[PDB]
């Protein structure tokens, strides 16, 4: 109950492998689930234009 | 025989193999003549010969 199961088969596998795999889980479906509407893509171009232009001020 | 259709490459395509061999020979003798003239040019260029 302490060496096996809880430590090896519960804890260490949860922390490095499973937690990172779950991070990739949660950030793959919020990254690659866009419907395909040209609008929202183009406003993504939009706010990026100012963030590059004035907010960060890349040129400055 | 066997396959009733004539095999696509069932005959020795003589022209193509001819140019392949002729090329390989050309590339080879061009290569070794090239190497000989580079080495001779080198020795007569830097003062070896």
């Amino acid at each position: 109950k302490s060496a096996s199961s809880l430590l090896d088969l519960i804890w260490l596998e949860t922390i490095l492998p499973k937690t990172t795999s779950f991070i990739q889980m949660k950030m793959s479906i919020m990254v690659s689930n866009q419907k395909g509407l040209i609008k929202l893509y183009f406003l993504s171009f939009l706010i990026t234009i100012m963030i590059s232009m004035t907010l960060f001020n890349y040129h400055e | 025989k066997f396959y009733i259709r004539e095999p696509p490459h069932g005959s020795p395509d003589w022209l193509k193999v001819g140019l392949t061999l002729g090329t390989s020979v050309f590339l080879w003798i061009y290569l070794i003549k090239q190497h000989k003239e580079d080495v001779l040019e080198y020795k007569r260029r830097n003062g070896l010969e």
């Binding site: - | 193509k16 193999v17 392949t20 061999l21 090329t23 390989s24 590339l27 080879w28 061009y30 290569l31 070794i32 090239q34 190497h35 580079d38 080495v39 040019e41 080198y42 260029r45 830097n46």
Partner: protein, 120 residues
């Protein structure tokens, strides 16, 4: 390390002053590997067309190994050429700029005071 080098003729594989360098030997280990690199292309070709891999049309293998070893040879001269030029203007810049490369003084280990670390 280069495209802005003075007197650099464009679209010119092997410049004339490269010939002053030692041409790669026909038995150069790199060259013979790229000849072997020709064999892998030939052996795969028979495999793709599900032809007898070991001995399908040695004519195809011949150009595959001869063309690859050729284009390898010219590449090696250019390879040596750029490495020579990189080492050429190397020393020219160093000699023409003595101040930027001070003659560091050499001191034997009897004069330095390196402190030993007890590793226990």
């Amino acid at each position: 390390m280069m495209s802005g080098r003075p007197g650099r003729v464009p679209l010119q594989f092997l410049p004339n002053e490269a010939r002053s360098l030692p041409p790669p030997k026909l038995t150069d280990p790199r060259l013979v590997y790229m000849g072997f690199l020709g064999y892998c292309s030939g052996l795969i070709d028979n495999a793709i067309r599900r032809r007898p891999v070991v001995s399908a049309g040695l004519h195809r293998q011949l150009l595959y190994v001869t063309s690859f070893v050729f284009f390898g040879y010219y590449l090696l001269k250019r390879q040596d050429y750029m490495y020579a030029l990189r080492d050429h203007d190397m020393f020219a810049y160093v000699k023409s700029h003595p101040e930027d490369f001070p003659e560091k003084d050499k001191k034997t280990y009897g004069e330095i005071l390196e402190e030993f670390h007890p590793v226990r």
